[PDB]
Amino acid sequence: GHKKIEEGKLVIWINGDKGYNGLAEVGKKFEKDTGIKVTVEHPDKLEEKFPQVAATGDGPDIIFWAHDRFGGYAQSGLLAEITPAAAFQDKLYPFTWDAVRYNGKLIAYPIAVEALSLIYNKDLLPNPPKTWEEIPALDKELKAKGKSALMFNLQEPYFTWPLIAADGGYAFKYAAGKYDIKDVGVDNAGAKAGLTFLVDLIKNKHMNADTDYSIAEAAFNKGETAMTINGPWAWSNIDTSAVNYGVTVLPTFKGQPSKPFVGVLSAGINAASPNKELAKEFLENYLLTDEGLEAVNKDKPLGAVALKSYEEELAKDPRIAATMENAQKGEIMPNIPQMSAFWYAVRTAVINAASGRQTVDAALAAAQTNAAA
Ligand SMILES: OC[C@H]1O[C@H](O[C@H]2[C@H](O)[C@@H](O)[C@@H](O)O[C@@H]2CO)[C@H](O)[C@@H](O)[C@@H]1O
Ligand SMILES: [Cu+2]
């Protein structure tokens, strides 16, 4: 890594929860056809490392993340403008392009639409609950049989946001077709109700504040818990397990739907890459094809891909129908540079409230001020 970005090869960064072995296979096909070697890496804290190394002219040729970080990368000067032809643009849904547009420029290729769904064990729970409010009662009932109702990652605000946003929580107000960076909705009554409900689930021992991705995945996949909250990428490991699972609508809170933040998995080209044409060729002609997306989706499901041709095939899968039904109830993440600060603030708020180190009201009051920074 001592020679900066090397000309005549492609280095790709993608998060470890994604289908990197699939993407590697698309890499191999590219190498066979072009002679250009493609390396797929999955470094820890990818989304934090990229801006550090990209600024010095290092790091990958291509970076994969949800669109929410890309505005920051672009504002920081780390992303090449992408120049897809109208012919190519027509192959992907316009709303996916909308997610990767910053100051009227396209700054990434959209790949797939992700939203959290309720995942339930059909053998333990033939009828999943429609409301958050009925989960304590269900937990009391399952705890008698040595089970629990619900376990999900409490360490990442992505997973708790849906409950927080349900009764009127929001990140940045979309007003007059723009995001108001002065109008943050993390310390409003809805957000407070939402987080208070979550902290109560913990106080009444229906959930544990320390529960992370691994613990929740293990618990559900061993059939110790009736329900989890997760994204398409998680289905592969549940398939391999004994569990007969359904993916369905998230529970309502105070009779309003859970509002998951919708992410578009996106591929940006490092502004310092000397391999931009090769990156464009790889993403347009190899990855964003039925065969390309199929290779990745076979490893770990992408959700609802941006490519119309392949989306029409996958749309018939009720898991993806449920993904899109959840997506339609939530709102697409902003890509504005402030999202990084917002996420850091909400992360701290939820951990501090869940651990009991701070009150919900104080935790969220602090987050609100910190988000505008
Ligand atoms: O939790 C804050 C985190 O939320 C999102 O990250 C998700 C990501 O979108 C999913 O595709 C998957 O990788 O899991 C992540 C949750 O750990 C935001 O995109 C990210 O910026 C933010 O830090
Ligand atoms: Cu080196």
Numbering used by the authors: -2 to 370
What does the primary publication say about this deposited structure?
To test our predictions that single-site GHK-Cu phasing could be universally applicable, we cloned, expressed and crystallized a complex between maltose-binding protein and a 29-residue FG-containing peptide from the amino-terminal region of Tetrahymena thermophila MacNup98a. The non-GHK-tagged protein had previously undergone screening using 14 commercial screens and failed to produce any hits; however, the GHK-tagged protein produced six hits in these commercial crystallization screens, with condition 1-29 from the Morpheus screen producing the best crystals. From this crystal form, we collected 3 × 360° (1080°) of data at different positions within the same crystal. The data were collected at 1.3776 Å (9.0 keV) with an anomalous scattering of 3.88 e for Cu. The theoretical Bijvoet ratio for GHK-MBP-Nup98 (12 × 43.3 kDa) at this wavelength was 1.41%. The diffraction extended to 2.7 Å resolution and, although the anomalous signal was much weaker than for the GHK-GFP cases, automatic structure solution was again possible using CRANK2. The final structure contained 12 molecules per asymmetric unit. All copper sites refined with an occupancy of 1.0 but with an unusual copper(II) coordination. The equatorial plane ligand and the apical water molecule are replaced by residues His39-Pro40 from a symmetry molecule. Unfortunately, the C-terminal FG-containing peptide is highly disordered in the crystal structure and we were unable to visualize the interactions between FG motifs.
